[PDB]
Each structure stands twice: as structure tokens, then as C-alpha cells.
């Protein structure tokens, strides 16, 4: 009988056998849950419990043992598992299934155990309905989701409160046995580790049975999630015996293709409106190949290896199912074809489109001029915007530690072409003063300002070098631009000057949102995921991509 | 009683239980082997067999079922497994261990089964002693190796005759349960897939128990090894029921540091002898910064990201244990510190040293000239030699599909800076004819030769584009050099000219050995591994590196 806690004593000569019978009517799935524990603190004689089905046999040893790194062992006493859910179809029949539960051990004196069995009342997840459940490293849980007729793709969202312990969320097709162990859950299907948040995007076309399992498994230790380790002189960590993690799981229906074309149209058209706006001004007004050839060879030749590398990354993550390889923003990531994140890709179109307009207007200026005012450097930074925009997008196909270096290498390429923290701050101080009645006052002001960041870098010591470099470059360039304004006023159009500040003010708002942070473990990078914010298709980092284009464009227009 | 085959019938009401008792004396390990089979062709009622130890329980179902890709099912009737080998120490005692074997099922009529049990006579592998054994997908195997006192590192080498089926060889520490299943063997320890050859290098410092298990597991399909699939209309592939693979395993003692230092000293001292010969010639005789700066900036800024990517690969392959990530030559791979292949790294010192000597002699020539003869292109090609050598070494830290593109990208960059198969052959023909009484005859000869290579490329269609490009370039350059020789002879030192041909012949000899080929599955790349050939520390590809270095040096000296 389910919902009852059996108690018994097992030893060498005596074993206990309990046969359970139950039925599962068609169109209803009934998963059995086994609840066992043992009070035997000894490990030389663990109690062995087996559950036998019509086709599958599952067995475990109690108290459960885990062998983490640095040869620490653990004694988990409460163990539990879910059996393979037999599925019934329109071929009707009250299937009078029976499940054998047998327990035995070889302890010379004995080992106490209490066994409880019960069907899971909430085993089939419902769409958009949040469910709450508690999982333990020795008590894994998994549930079945069935696709609806209209919906063709879903996003499964999991949120926890306390970051530790580490946990893994896996999605597999319905072919039992179900892989719900720490050493085996990673073999099949899609999965990702997590501490606080997770999100897996699925398509119905990849599941022939139009129903899939969702498996939750809690790790014994927390290295894989970037956690620490309490150094204890006792090999058997008896303190780590009641690990738990309150969990909430919600399955939302993925957006339809209607918003896909709406968001894409919005991106293209507004920059097309910039084309129309510039053309309207032109009609109203109507009423050096060495650098080009060298840079085009450098850009093309450098791009191809990273595209081959990244498309290789994209392919392997697509087939292996290891979703912790790429550091996406899994709450606001949208797939199309082979790309697993399309919003982060299309969002870089503005860089390509705005830069194209910059090259055309400079060409127009050059043509009119022909019919120290040089546009060669303008073309170099104009191409710089194009190449980075395409290259940054290809980085976002699968963001990682490896391909971030290639993201900023091209910026380092151009910077050179134009030409431990104490040392780093001191060198930055030297660069600030070497780069540049009242002339001395402003020079002291600029050096004092650059010294404030020097104290910031030396004390705070941020983990992102590129962000620190860009902030220094942004602050210094605006200072030079502000320098140009004040003396021009003192020397006796304007809208572009004002507009540059507004977008730059907007740009830095979304720059510091850090929704994805790859320097930590992939689980921690998923703590900072945030939902879609623009047209239900874009997130904050894409908004950073948009404003960074117009901020650079307006600043470049002043230049 | 071991070495006996029991026969029995199973059904709902009757189960069979057989208790075995045996002892394992100290310093001797005794692994039990279970050999089960069932004749029930039905899959709706498989017979479930469990083996219970003092601590561990292992259960399985017969006929074993596998679910490969494309939803093909496989039914194996012969199953087999090895139990946890209980270890005994100098704390003596004839441990009178017991092992229960319980077989049961719920088939309405029943199922036949035959069960045999036996201790493995050859369970502890001996050093340098080849062992032969047959493995099956449903009959995995594993054996224990114990390190000797003097030896501190070993290389385990596995050889098979027939390439298929695909197999996996793993090495784990002694902490049972032992991972000997297709879905679980990949979790812990080191492992690699293979068809014909495999080799794992192990150090004693990484195993606290100074003894490790080696597990052979045969895959159900051959997709992971690049195999094909017989498309059959029957879902239950009854033909795939007797898969077997003969195997030979041999553990060789890894070389000591003496040969390491001998080979390193040999290389360094022969190139220092080239230096000494150049200095002796000089003593006997005694009796443009824009290009440099641009090339050094480009080289450094392009090199740094690929070094970062390659060191990340090395770290992940070192920590994960996935040895199929890098396409080494595992028979002649030697570790030192964090590098898992040192010979392929040290072998590139010749490129750097020969390039350095070339730069020094060009500088000497320039200095003597100062006190259309331009050396700028000579400096550019010397820097190209340096950079290509360093980058080839960094690629050889871990060879892969991804980083070969970066390997060829620097050469492509240099070629550009100096400036579907039918279309490729036509374009190659056009390039050959565009690049270049008797002048017509020799031009026709060269065009016909390039047409012969065009036909080769169009018909054979090699999978390596870089090799084909390098061969074409080498042939054209040698043709140009021979042309210069003959027209200098007709116009009315030499040792270098003579030696260039010999070193190029040796270079091609060792280049066409293709010991590693990454375009296929890693198992196929391991099919072509060859043992160490020079000083017991170098293989054919390192000899290719050396001969390419000296051939390039001599050819450039001719130039
Ligand atoms: C469950 O099935 C077994 C045999 O299949 C039978 O003996 C038992 O009575 C069944 N349980 C119930 C409650 O009928
Ligand atoms: C064992 O589990 C049962 C239910 O699963 C519970 O009632 C009992 O308190 C547990 N025993 C211990 C010692 O935790
Ligand atoms: C037959 O299947 C359909 C859809 O699967 C279901 O709605 C219906 O209830 C089934 N019929 C019976 C008698 O259960
Ligand atoms: C093996 O052990 C069991 C109990 O531990 C005992 O009954 C049996 O006699 C032993 N076998 C032999 C051959 O003594
Ligand atoms: C089953 O295995 C035993 C030994 O393991 C062997 O003697 C017997 O021939 C096998 N039966 C079949 C049908 O293969
Ligand atoms: C004690 O251990 C050593 C080394 O492990 C072994 O050679 C020796 O035979 C052992 N003593 C006995 C009595 O087995």
C-alpha cells in the first residue's frame, strides 16, 4: 500500500520482500516514488535495496556514498528515486502492473531501514503553471512534459533561492531507463549545470514522441558550480548528510514566428529610416588605396579562422547537448535553424548598417571636396566599426573564454596599426600624462581625473580587462571632444553634439547590466540572466549593441 | 562452484538463487566473472539477473537492449560482467567472501537462461607482456595494473585487427563500482575511443593507490568511430547479436628522463654545431623599419589569441580526461609538466634556430654591403619562417580541426601581403599560366606539368587543401630554381644547391607518412599511429619538421 512507511530489520539470514500492485489508465501517467533511509552509520555493511519492474531493475546501496575530489567521502542516509513510468495508449486496458521491492544486506548484526512508497500526484508538468519541489543529491527528481497541439516549442525555466548546492537540469526523450545519476545524467539529451537559474530551449521537431522527460539531479559537491570546500580532518563528512535545494520549475510557451518577423522588421526599418533621413537631408541640400587594400586583406584573413572555430563550437554544442559550453543569456535566447541565439546575432546589424552610412557620407564629402582635411583615418575607423560588428556578432554565436580574446584582438590590431595591479595602474598613469594660465589647470584636471580611475583599478581590481580599457578610452575621448567644444566657444551641426551625450548616457546604463559573465563557472554566469525586454525578443545586452552604434556614429560624426 | 554452467527456467512464480563463496589471499586480486545468456527472443519480458556482494549490487536485463541513433534497436543475448575485486593488504586473513546471484522475471510462460561463473586467471596485467582477449558490446572487460617500484610512468597500448566495431579504452583509479558501461564509462578517469590502435600515457604521481583499472567497452554502433549503418526495415536488428572484437593489450614502461635530456641535447647541439660551422666559415673569411614594425605587431597580435585558445584546450583536455579532443600521435607522445606531447613541441626549435641564423647572415651581408640587391623580402621570409615555426609548435600542443585553420591563416596572410573541384582545377590552371625558339618549349613544359597536377587534384580530390597548396608551391619554386640554374649555365655556393635537393627529397619522404589525420574520427586518426623512431623520442612528423627546416634554409640560401 502506497503512502505508508514500512519499518524492518535486515541481517545476513533475513530479507524483506514487498510486492506492490497498481494500475495506470490510458492518457494518464503514474510514476512510482521510493522513499528509503537507513540509520546504520557503518559503511562496511551498507543495506542494499532493489526495485523490480516488468522490464527494468533498479538497485542502490544505503547509506549512499560519493567520492568527490581530494578524496573526501560522504554518508547520505536518505535516498529516493523514481521508477520508469509505463505509458498507456488508446489501446485501452487497466494495466494491472506490479513492482517488486526487495531489501537485503550482509551486516553481521543488522542495519535499520524505513521504506515508503507513493505515486507522484504532480508528475506531468502543465504549461505556464509554476511548480515547487525540493531535490536532494541522494533524492533526484524528474517529471514528464507533454507538448500541446498548437505549441511547437517551449522554454523551461528553473529558479532556486540559495546558490548552493550545485545542481544539474537535464531533458531527455522518453526511452527508459531514465538517466538521473550524477555520473550518468550527462550521457544523453540536453542538460546544463546551475546554481540559481537555468533555461533550456526545445523544439517539438526533435522529439518523435512529442513528450520529453525533465530530470533534476543535485551534485554532491560544489566545485562544478564554483563553490568552496570545508577542509575537514574527517574523511567521512557526516555533516554533509541533509543537503537540500528548494526548486521551482515553470514551462513557458516559446514565442511564435510572428514576433520573429516583427522584431527583425523593427531592426532593419529603423536603420533604413536612418538611410531615408540622410537621403532627405541630401535632397534638401540639393535645392589612398594602400590602406584599403591592406586592411581588407587583414580583416578577411583574420576573420575566417574564428568563423571556422566558432561554427565548430556551434556544431559540437548542437550535437553533444553540453549547454554549459556557451555563455548565452538563456532567458532571452532565441533559436533559428542552427543558431541557438538569434537575438544576440541580429542585434549587431546596426553596427554594419550605421557604419555603411558613415562610409557613404564620407565618400560624398570626398567627392564634393574634389569638385589637413584628410578622410583616410575616418575610413580606417569606419572600417573598424564594420569589422568589429561582424566579428562581435560571430563571438555571440557561442560566447566563451577562448573567443573573447579574438573579439578584442582586432581592436588591439587596429590600435597598434595607428601607432601586478600596482604596475598596471602606474603604467596607465604614465600613458595618461604622455598622451596629452589655464592650460596647466585643465592638464592637472585631466591627470587628476585619470588618477581616480587608477585608484579604482588598483583597489577594486575588476576581472574584465577590456571593459576597463574601453571605459578609459571613452572617458578620455569625450574629454578631448569636450576640450574641443570649450575652446571653440572661446574662439568665437549642433544637434549631433547634444545627441552624442544622450545615447552615450543610455549606452552606459545597459553596459553595466552584465547579464552574462563568462569569467566564472557557467552556473554562476546563469545567475545574472534576465528576461527579454524589447518586443519580447531583445535583452539588455542587445540594447547595448544598438546604442553603442549610434553613440559611436554621433561621436564619429563630430570627428 | 565456478567453471560450471547452470541451466534454468524462469517465470512469474519461481526465482533462482545461487550463493558462491570464495577467498582472496593478500597481495593477490581475484575478480569474479559472470557469463549469462537467455534464449527468449521476446522483449516484453526480459529476465533480470542481479549479483550482490558484501557492499555492491549490480543488476542487468537479458536480452540486453541498446537504442542507437535513428531509433534502431539492438537485442544482445550473451551478457557478461566483472564484479568489484575486493583487495586484501598485509593485514592478513583468508577473507571468506560470499556473492549472491539472483535471477528472476515475470514472463507469463518463462524464459531460459544459462549462467556461468569463473575467476579471471589473467586479471593483473604484467609489464611488457602482451595479453590477448575478446571483448563484446554486451561483454565488457577490465583488468588491474599495479605499478612497479622503479617505474614511475607507463604507456598502455591496445591493438585490434578488424577496425569495426568501435571500442573505448578507459583508465580509472581503484574505487569501485567500476564504470564499464557505454553511457557511464566516459564519466570518470581517462578514456579514448578507437577502432584499431590506442595508447594512453599514465604517470604514477596521479594515482595514490599506485594501481589502476583499465576498462575495455565495445560500442553498440560504429557512428562514434566513423562507421556506417546497414539500413534495415526491421527495428529489432537481430543480425547484430554476435558482435565481437579480438584485442591485444601491452603495458610498456615509459622512458626515463635520460633519453629526454639526450634527445634535447642532440637537437640543441646539432643546431649549435650549425652555428659553429657558420662562425668558422666567417672566421676563415676573416683571414625599412616600417615592414619590421608592421610584421612584428601583426605577428604578436595574431599569435596571442591562438596561444590563449590552445592553452585553454590543453587545460580542458588535461582536466576532463577526454583524450579524443586532440589528434596526437599517441604512440610517440611524451609528456612534460602540462604538455601532453613534448617531442612535437621541441621538434620545432630547428625552425626558430635556422631562421635566426638566416637573419644573422642577412644582417652580416647588409653590413658588409653598406661598408636591385635588396634584402627586405629576405627579412620578410625569415620572419615568416620564425612565425610559422612558433605557430606550428603551438598548434602541435593540441592538433585539431579548429586550429589548423589558424595554422594556415598566417601563411595566407603573408601570401596576401606579398601581393566544385572542376572550378578549383580551372582556377589553379589559370594561376599557373598567369604566374609565368626555346622559351615556348619550356613554358609549354611547365604548363603541362601544372596541368598534370590539375588532373591529379580533379580526380583524386585529396581531403587536405594545405598539403596540395604546399606541394604546388614547392614544385613551382623548384622549377623556377632549376630554370635559374640552367640559364645561368647557358650564360657562362654549389654545395647548397646540391644539398637542397637531398633535404627536399627527405622532407617529402617523411611528409608523406601521414601518421595523424584529423579530418576523420579520432579513432581513424589513431589507426595510423606509428612508434617512436629517432632516439626513442621522435617520430616521422618531427623528422618532417627538421627536414622542412633545413630544406627551407638551403633553398633560401640559394635565393
Ligand atoms: C497484483 O498482481 C498480482 C499478480 O500479478 C496479484 O496476485 C495481486 O492480487 C494484484 N493486486 C491486487 C490488489 O489485485
Ligand atoms: C525515513 O524516511 C521516512 C519517510 O521516508 C521518515 O518518516 C523517517 O522519519 C525517516 N527516518 C529518518 C531517521 O530520517
Ligand atoms: C484516443 O486518443 C485521443 C488523443 O490521443 C484522446 O483524446 C482520446 O480520449 C482517446 N480515446 C480514448 C477512448 O481514450
Ligand atoms: C561461504 O560462507 C557462507 C556464509 O558466510 C557459509 O555458509 C558457506 O559454508 C561458506 N562456503 C564454504 C565453502 O565454506
Ligand atoms: C550460453 O553461455 C554458455 C557459457 O557462458 C555457453 O556454454 C552456451 O552455449 C551459451 N548458450 C547459447 C545459446 O549461446
Ligand atoms: C607485506 O607487504 C610487502 C609489500 O607490500 C610484501 O612484500 C609482503 O609479502 C607482505 N607481507 C606478508 C606477510 O604478506
Residue numbers in the entry:
A (entry chain B), B (entry chain A): 47 to 333, 441 to 524, 539 to 586, 628 to 644, 681 to 736, 743 to 809
Reproduce the article's own wording on this structure.
Human SIDT1 and SIDT2 are closely related members of the SID-1 transmembrane family, and have been implicated in various biological processes such as glucose and lipid metabolism, innate immunity, and tumorigenesis. Here, we present the cryo-electron microscopy (cryo-EM) structures of human SIDT1 and SIDT2. Both structures reveal an overall architecture of a dimeric arrangement composed of an extracellular domain (ECD) rich in β-strands and a transmembrane domain (TMD) with 11 passes, highlighting the remarkable structural congruence. Importantly, the ECDs of SIDT1 and SIDT2 bind synthetic plant-derived miRNA only under acidic conditions.
SIDT1 predominantly localizes to the plasma membrane and enhances the cellular uptake of synthetic small interfering RNA (siRNA)7 and plant-derived microRNA (miRNA). Mechanistic analyses found that uptake of miRNAs by SIDT1 is lowpH-dependent. We first solved cryo-EM structures of SIDT1 and SIDT2 at overall resolutions of 3.33 Å and 3.17 Å, respectively. The electron density maps exhibited well-defined main-chain connectivity and side-chain densities in the ECDs, while the TMDs have relatively lower quality and resolution. Bioinformatics analysis predicted eight N-glycosylation sites in SIDT1, with three glycosylation sites resolved in the EM map. The SIDT1 ECD consists of two subdomains, ECD1 and ECD2, connected by a flexible loop. The dimer interface of the SIDT1 ECD can be divided into two regions. In SIDT1, the dimer interface primarily involves TM2 interacting with TM5 from the other protomer and is driven by extensive hydrophobic interactions. Cryo-EM structures of SIDT1 and SIDT2 show highly conserved features despite only 57% sequence identity.
